[PDB]
DNA sequence: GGGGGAAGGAAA
DNA sequence: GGCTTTCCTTCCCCC
């Protein structure tokens, strides 16, 4: 394989500096306003002028404003970034039939029937970047390599607005020098567990006894890291069909009172069905986040499609099961639909 | 022993 | 804090 990875730059914030060009140069910060007080929520994304100062995905909208109090804070327009994204995706579908849409702003292209070497791959990349810049004035980064994992890593290294290749020789250099915590699919929890085992690089997984890896991070993530360490990782570029869709809302104030909860839940279901659009789900899950923020969720799977009426009736049953089996207060309430048809 | 599953992770 | 969507890793049902 010769994989080609695209990763739209500071995406949500770009798609904002593209419908109001006056923003370029100024720090922008797309936030998610939760709804329980002046500026409560978090930062979705922030253009690079804002990151230079500490504002990044995650930190509360309130820390953001303490750091860059005079920045352009805008609310999240997800339905809008979603379209811009698709339009771009469609642009990429021409450069190859084998495409995997990883996220709302990440796509893997398998161009192993579209080019011959990394020099051709690299040129196809630039061609792509440009096309995108031409049609939607959106810069994106490109990473090319022998599999999805190293193509992604490539882009991680080149973003923003770049292009790169980690040829067969580099891969071995990396399997040895790349901080394993920088490997796609390894976060803080698993990173720590691996640091405790002396595993700081990929190559470090071939030495540790296996079953003592399966023991600490999980059978799957273990297999994952090793195959990568053996330069034997090959996950095909497969079309991805969305598997779930949901919406959680945040209540104006905590409670365990079913009738105080009901309005928000029914409000989330509605919005949830608007999204589904033609998709019929056979499984519904009610999700609530206790005052302490842990995540409780009860579900049920049907042997047929779920009609709102059903979603309505059944979701109350579920919600109840939560209230009956958890004594904590609720602040967040929502739903989620799976097992489409 | 294991193939095929509802809930709480763990990462993006 | 912090959506939204993933895989998963357990605790089962039953071969
Ligand atoms: N905690 C996060 C991380 C990411 N995103 C969103 O996910 C998409 C891209 O992911 P990410 O790479 O994390 O954000 P970017 O702003 O695109 O940063 P960069 O260009 O450096 O990758 C963005 O459109 C945004 C989000 O809502 N919340
Ligand atoms: Ca991105
Ligand atoms: Ca991304
Ligand atoms: Ca990453
Ligand atoms: Ca990491």
Atom of ligand 1 nearest to the CA of A160: 20
Tokens linked to A233 = 């990782």
CB atoms within 10 A of CB A150: 27
Shared-domain flag, residues A151 and A86 = yes
Distance CA A54, CA A52 (A): 6
Cis peptide before A160 (omega within 30 of 0): yes
Shared-domain flag, residues A265 and A130 = no
**Own/partner pairs, A20-24, CB within 8 angstroms, 24+ separation:** A23/A47, A23/A72
A58 lines ligand 1 (CB under 6 A): yes
Look at residues A232, A235, A267, A231 and name the one whose alpha carbon lies nearest to residue A249: A267
Shared-domain flag, residues A204 and A298 = no
Shared-domain flag, residues A6 and A18 = no
Q: What is the resolution of this structure in A?
A: 2.9
Biggest alpha carbon distance in chain A?
64
Give how far the C-alpha of residue A194 lies from the chain's centroid of Cα atoms, to the nearest Å: 23
A159 lines ligand 1 (CB under 6 A): yes
Residues packed against strand C, CB within 7 Å: A 32, 34, 36, 40-44, 57-58, 60, 78, 218-221, 224, 240, 242-248, 250, 275, 293, 332, 334, 336
Residues with C-beta atoms within 5 A of ion ligand 5: A 181
Shared-domain flag, residues A123 and A6 = yes
Shared-domain flag, residues A155 and A249 = no
Shared-domain flag, residues A6 and A47 = no
Residue A238 lies in a domain: no
Atom of ligand 1 nearest to the CA of A51: 21
**Own/partner pairs, A43-47, CB within 8 angstroms, 24+ separation:** A44/A12, A44/A76, A45/A10, A45/A11, A45/A12, A45/A13, A46/A10, A46/A13, A46/A71, A47/A10, A47/A13, A47/A14, A47/A17, A47/A23
Distance CA A294, CA A182 (A): 27
Look at residues A123, A340, A125, A102 and name the one whose alpha carbon lies nearest to residue A235: A102
Q: Which residue has the tokens 């040829």?
A: A167
The closest residue, in CA terms, to atom 23 on ligand 1 is A11
- Structure-determination technique: X-ray
Give how far the C-alpha of residue A143 lies from the chain's centroid of Cα atoms, to the nearest Å: 18
Shared-domain flag, residues A109 and A218 = no
Distance of CA A106 from the midpoint of ligand 3 (Å): 6
Whole domain around residue A315: which residue ranges?
A: 244-341
Residue A107 CA distance to nucleotide C11 C1' (Å):
36
Query: How many structural domains compose chain A?
Result: 4
Give how far the C-alpha of residue A311 lies from the chain's centroid of Cα atoms, to the nearest Å: 27
Q: Which residue has the tokens 């990396």?
A: A174
Shared-domain flag, residues A95 and A200 = no
Q: Is the dihedral of CA A66, A68, A70, A71 positive or negative?
A: negative
Residue A239 lies in a domain: no
Residue A51 CA distance to nucleotide C14 C1' (Å):
55
């Amino acid at each position: 394989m010769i994989v080609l990875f695209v990763d739209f730059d500071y995406f949500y914030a770009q798609v904002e500096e593209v419908l109001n060009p006056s923003l370029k140069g100024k720090p922008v910060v797309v936030c998610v306003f939760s709804g329980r007080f002046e500026d409560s929520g978090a930062v979705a994304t922030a253009n690079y002028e804002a990151r230079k100062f500490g504002v990044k995905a995650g930190i509360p909208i309130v820390e953001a404003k303490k750091i860059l109090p005079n920045a352009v804070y805008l609310p999240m327009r997800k339905e809008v970034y979603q379209q811009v994204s698709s339009r771009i995706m469609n642009l990429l579908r021409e450069y190859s039939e084998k495409i995997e849409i990883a996220s709302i702003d990440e796509a893997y292209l398998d161009i192993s029937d579209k080019v011959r070497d990394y020099r051709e791959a690299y040129n196809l990349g630039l061609e792509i970047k440009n096309k995108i810049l031409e049609k939607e004035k959106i810069t994106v980064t490109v990473g090319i390599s022998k599999n999805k994992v190293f193509a992604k890593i490539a882009a991680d290294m080149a973003k923003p607005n770049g292009i790169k290749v980690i040829d067969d020789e580099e891969v071995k250099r990396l399997i040895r020098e790349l901080d394993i915590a920088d490997v796609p699919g390894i976060g803080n929890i698993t990173a720590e567990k691996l640091k405790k085992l002396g595993i700081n690089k990929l190559v470090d997984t071939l030495s540790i006894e296996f079953d003592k890896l399966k023991g600490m991070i999980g059978e799957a993530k273990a297999k994952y890291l090793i195959s990568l360490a053996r330069d034997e990782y090959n996950e095909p570029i497969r079309t991805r069909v969305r598997k779930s869709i949901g919406r959680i809302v945040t209540m104006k104030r905590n409670s365990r009172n079913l009738e105080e909860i009901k309005p928000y839940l029914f409000r989330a279901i509605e919005e949830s069905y608007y999204k589904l659009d033609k998709r019929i789900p056979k499984a519904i899950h009610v999700v609530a986040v206790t005052e302490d923020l842990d995540i409780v969720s009860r579900g049920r799977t049907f042997p047929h499609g779920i009609s709102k009426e059903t979603a309505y009736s059944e979701s109350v049953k579920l919600l109840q099961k939560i209230l009956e089996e958890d004594e904590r207060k609720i602040r967040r309430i929502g739903v989620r639909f799976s097992k489409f048809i």
